[PDB]
Design a protein around this ligand. Structure first.
Ligand SMILES: CC(C)OCCn1c(=S)[nH]c(=O)c2[nH]ccc21
Length: 167
């Protein structure tokens, strides 16, 4: 048993809820929250800007030191950093950004990072401002992630679109 509440069960291991990922992290304090990161860990908008804002910019300060030491992530890659006040850890995962022209086939590689963690609170990757189709992102998630994933999909309209169409 875990602390996640109000989720619809899609599969053996994938759950979904109409909830903002920041408010969910603050309530649950999960072991792992996933950030929808870019390769530079520049948290400006979407999930990254909201999580960083909720950490009072401590996520960005930590991320800038990570990049200064290690250089940029790969598209499809990840790193584990602090979860600050939101979670034990933040798994920063880079899905392909369609609005920058990246290979959508890299979305499966992105989701494979989740399999290194037994339980995660996560957005969809590559949807919203990243330019891909969220229905596709949910299908790749279900067909790639084997660990237990709780998908916090921001508002009613995106929640309603994903559930009704789910195969
Ligand atoms: C940044 C990209 C991946 O956004 C996807 C949509 N998204 C989702 S799925 N859950 C949230 O909680 C959330 N907050 C802001 C955006 C957002």
């Amino acid at each position: 048993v875990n602390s996640f509440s109000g989720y619809l069960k899609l599969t053996d291991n994938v759950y979904i809820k109409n909830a903002d990922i920041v408010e969910e992290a603050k309530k649950v304090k999960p072991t792992v929250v996933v950030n929808a990161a870019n390769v530079y860990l520049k948290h400006g908008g979407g999930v990254a800007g909201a999580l960083n804002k909720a950490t009072n910019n401590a996520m960005q300060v930590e991320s800038d030191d990570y990049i200064a030491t290690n250089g940029p992530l790969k598209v499809g890659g990840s790193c584990v950093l602090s979860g600050h006040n939101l979670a034990k850890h933040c798994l920063h995962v880079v899905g392909p950004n369609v609005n920058k022209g990246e290979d959508i086939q890299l979305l499966k590689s992105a989701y494979e990072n989740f399999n290194q963690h037994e339980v995660l609170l996560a957005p969809l990757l590559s949807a919203g401002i990243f330019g891909a189709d969220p229905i596709h992102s949910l299908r790749v998630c279900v067909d790639t992630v084997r660990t237990n994933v709780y998908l916090a999909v921001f508002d009613k309209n995106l929640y309603d679109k994903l559930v009704s169409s789910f195969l």
